[PDB]
Nucleic acid binder design. Structure first.
Ligand SMILES: O=C(NC[C@H]1CN(c2ccc(N3CCOCC3=O)cc2)C(=O)O1)c1ccc(Cl)s1
Ligand SMILES: [Ca+2]
Ligand code: NA
Lengths: 51, 231
RNA sequence: GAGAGCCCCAGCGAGAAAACGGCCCCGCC
């Protein structure tokens, strides 16, 4: 589960009722796929800056 | 930082610099939010009074997007001791919010259990700062990849007690380490192109000495204390 | 785990030349 490549999660992975659950740090939204983490604004935490 | 590389444009945007009355940098910090900076408790005993500079990369040339913020509140961990450097953590609340921009962005606070299972078990983390380049302070912000070192090796290596609020990172003999001036700064761990706060530069016996490592405050033991301290 | 004794408390309270114990985080029978 979470030991197999982080459960396919972008960020946090937890095991709940025999199943993977993905979540994200504040400033990110969980994507439609329940796995990817999507920045809400231009400077999300933990991202190197480009502009 | 001893060895390592310069932080190139936008590469270490969570770096904060604590600056004293004579605008001399003396400690690092990590940007957590618009209002909050993570630093070492022992950094509060170095300068008479201080402010926080963010968005700086070359101190010699002060033109660009640097900004100095005044500290409204200092939140030192009540259990910090200079006799052991145990509980070496503090949080600063700023009077003015930081405007995130190029070279100015917060590092992510991970959830604890995931941090323990997934970040602390990575091969390496990244340390940064404006500190000395050997055991003397850099005019440019530098970064360095430091391997996690197992606790038993760290404890055997050390002249001082390594508590559960500490971890080792760096190299046995290779001339790469944090140094004087980097204290309080970021140790962050990369996971899928996102950087998570995993340590605070705390102390070392010298810098890059053979059979010694960098000692970092284990942020995972303080994630709850950090949440409290950020209201 | 729990209870207790203490220690700590640069955060929310309260108070008295702005590191000066009611509550959140936290330490050591
Ligand atoms: O600032 C550093 N060291 C520079 C300077 C600071 N320092 C140094 C400072 C404090 C203590 N300790 C050890 C913990 O108990 C209290 C104490 O007194 C040991 C070494 C030292 O020996 O040289 C660092 C080196 C590597 C990292 Cl990571 S931080
Ligand atoms: Ca500059
Ligand atoms: Na070394």
């Amino acid at each position: 589960l979470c030991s197999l490549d982080n459960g396919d999660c972008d960020q946090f992975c937890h095991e709940e009722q025999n199943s993977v659950v993905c979540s994200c740090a504040r400033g990110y939204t969980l994507a439609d796929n329940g796995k990817a983490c999507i920045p809400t604004g231009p400077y999300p935490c933990g991202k190197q800056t480009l502009e | 930082i001893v060895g390592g590389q310069e932080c190139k444009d936008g590469e270490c945007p969570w770096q904060a610099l604590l600056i004293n009355e004579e605008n001399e940098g003396f400690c690092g910090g990590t940007i957590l939010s618009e209002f909050y900076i993570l630093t070492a408790a022992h950094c509060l005993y170095q300068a008479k009074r201080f402010k926080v500079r963010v968005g700086d990369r070359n101190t010699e040339q002060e033109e660009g997007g640097e900004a100095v913020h005044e500290v409204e509140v200092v939140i030192k961990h009540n259990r910090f001791t200079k006799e052991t450097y145990d509980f070496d953590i503090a949080v600063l609340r700023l009077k003015t919010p930081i405007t995130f921009r190029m070279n100015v962005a917060p590092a992510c606070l991970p959830e604890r259990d995931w941090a323990e299972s997934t970040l602390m078990t990575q091969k390496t983390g990244i340390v940064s700062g404006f500190g000395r380049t050997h055991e003397r302070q850099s005019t440019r912000l530098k970064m360095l990849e430091v391997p996690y070192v197992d606790r038993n090796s760290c404890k055997l290596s050390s002249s001082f007690i390594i508590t559960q609020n500490m971890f080792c990172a760096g190299y046995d003999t290779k001339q790469e380490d944090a140094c004087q001036g980097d204290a309080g700064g970021p140790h962050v761990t990369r996971f899928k192109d996102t950087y998570f706060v995993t340590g605070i530069v705390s102390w070392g016996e010298g810098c890059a000495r053979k059979g010694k490592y960098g000692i970092y405050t284990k942020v995972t033991a303080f994630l709850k204390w950090i949440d409290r301290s950020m209201k």
